[PDB]
Amino acid sequence: DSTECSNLLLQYGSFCTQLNRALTGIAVEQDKNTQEVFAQVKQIYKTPPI
Amino acid sequence: GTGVLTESNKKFLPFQQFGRDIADTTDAVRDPQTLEILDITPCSFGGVSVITPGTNTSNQVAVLYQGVNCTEVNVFQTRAGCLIGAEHVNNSYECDIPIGAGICASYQSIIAY
């Protein structure tokens, strides 16, 4: 919550944007991986009762 | 520090004053005047995400506050966070805009399902 620290941090540029973008890419990549592995059928099949 | 003070169920020994968690952050503190224990929860912080369709179709937007309960900010509470501006419907459709925790959003106004 330090204003002075943020003001000094702004001098270094878009490092924070790069790190957030990379983490966002990893986060969407995990969901894409789960879709690729498990969501390979578009019909939800069910077993017969007997 | 900065935080939210709540009543604690901890059993601090008499010498002990402030409590630290696994990560060595102060999660509990004892008041020096009345000897009671208070948990220090970190203040609510989260990402603000804007859910929108294309600008060609519409200009309506919804906002998602990630990991923030709806009572500290068309209001719908999801596990992913608080969603403002999208109406919740009981019907299930295919995922158009992913929100998280099984919740997706679409435009038909913006609906969440």
Added chain:
Amino acid sequence: STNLVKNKCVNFNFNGLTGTGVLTESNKKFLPFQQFGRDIADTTDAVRDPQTLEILDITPCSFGGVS
């Protein structure tokens, strides 16, 4: 204010803005108040001459790998 040369890689000093670049004629029609020019990457690629009201493009001096 010395004479202005074009189509050569020179050290330019336009109103205290210094650098090294090839100064060529420009097709950009500047507004009367604007003096400098920037690209997408916030680098000065256009300038207006103070002596004569004309616009010049600054192409960077030739560089490349030698293999």
Added chain:
Amino acid sequence: NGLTVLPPLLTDEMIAQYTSALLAGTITSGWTFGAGPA
């Protein structure tokens, strides 16, 4: 300290449902459901 954990898009019950659908397809239909209609 600024760290947040985003929930997964597919919950555990939905992933279990996907596995159940795959199991039902491979038991009742063999490999036919993977290449077209079950």
Added chain:
Amino acid sequence: QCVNLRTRTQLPPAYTNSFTRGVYYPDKVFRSSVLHSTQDLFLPFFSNVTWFHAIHKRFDNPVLPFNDGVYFASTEKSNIIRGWIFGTTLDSKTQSLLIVNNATNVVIKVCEFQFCNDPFLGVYYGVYSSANNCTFEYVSQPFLNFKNLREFVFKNIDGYFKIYSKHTPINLVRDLPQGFSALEPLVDLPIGINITRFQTLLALHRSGWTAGAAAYYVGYLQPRTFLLKYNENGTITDAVDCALDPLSETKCTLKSFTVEKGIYQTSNFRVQPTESIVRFP
């Protein structure tokens, strides 16, 4: 010479919407086909802008606080509005800036004027009584149904007083037109004095006196970021207020005027500390 005007009719000042007006060029840099983000003193989109009228009996000349910057809009015909007065105390104790345009030439002066309580100009069909210490003079070109829209932005940063101006041919009868018009910087003035309060100058018509039909709007600037769009000719055609609504915030974050369908991370929400608590033994 000073004259008290005692024939005014009491009425509260009006308010209206700023729409997408008040935009100016942040710097002297030409940009082509690019989107540029600037953090400057800007007027918010769709803000509450104060409306004053000159009609006959209304003669609106109050003295307003300057704040951090001033947007002045003028729906004008027949050139009633002639200039402005800037200063702190508006007397000989401090130093004041005077901008006037009479029938012939535009005069800018920095003097210690003994201003009238009600200063005005007059045309037949009196601004100050004295000027003792004058430190700067500048003579310039003529700046000037309602037919003309005159938009000005005044800023006082680092002792430099920036005047941004734009003239628009309009045909709207009463309120501000809805549209986009970028204000070109007109005068960069080296004054280096304190300005906290201003007052505009009107012109009377004598046949007592009659006030010509005119309307002006006063808005205040706040520090914010705008996303400016530059066309192929380097003229600002559109702008986005990053703090107005979440859609424009998304546009500002993605640096594009068109946003595709999806979810986009735009900001961080932190609950601010409401109080401070100290507990000692």
Added chain:
Amino acid sequence: KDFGGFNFSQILPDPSKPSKRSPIEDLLFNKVT
């Protein structure tokens, strides 16, 4: 191009085009900016 009724014009190179590309390939190069 006697292939027993099979048509491959959309995937074979076009002699009329200077780039010697197929219509599908030409479309792919047009759609990437």
Added chain:
Amino acid sequence: SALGKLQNVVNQNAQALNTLVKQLSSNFGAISSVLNDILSRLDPPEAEVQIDRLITGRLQSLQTYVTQQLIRAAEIRASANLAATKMSECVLGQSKRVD
């Protein structure tokens, strides 16, 4: 130890988070690791230098953490692609590939 691969991934992620949080406690050559103490104890000309040292140390830690997160993301993506291949070829059909 049957489920070691998942536990390894969970342990690595938790350990990386714990290390990243733990790195805040390091002063990186400054007088203190707490920003409030530096801001309340020193004048801005030297407090700026101390905050700068803290910023560069924390930024280096965060960049390092992001770098290993990306490398682990690549490894998990490769494993997920392999898992998708096994799901397509072993579950949805009969595979003639040995082992």
Added chain:
Amino acid sequence: SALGKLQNVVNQNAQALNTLVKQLSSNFGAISSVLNDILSRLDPPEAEVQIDRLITGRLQSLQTYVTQQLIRAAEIRASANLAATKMSECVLGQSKRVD
């Protein structure tokens, strides 16, 4: 959105290059981001400190860019190996592998 996969690669490469050039405009705590301004405005004893700050900031930016490029190059190499496998097994022969 048919050709999104190529477009993402092109956009990521262009964005990385754009960010790398944008990093030159940051002073990294120095008085200015321009070397010529520092050389013309200050004596060499303080100029060495200012260029040292600019050099370390730009070097960190370039190292970050090279690391991101290496990770993306590894991902593209994996995709290219997959594409070569598809070219050998789907185009040059008939594959029994499901999906």
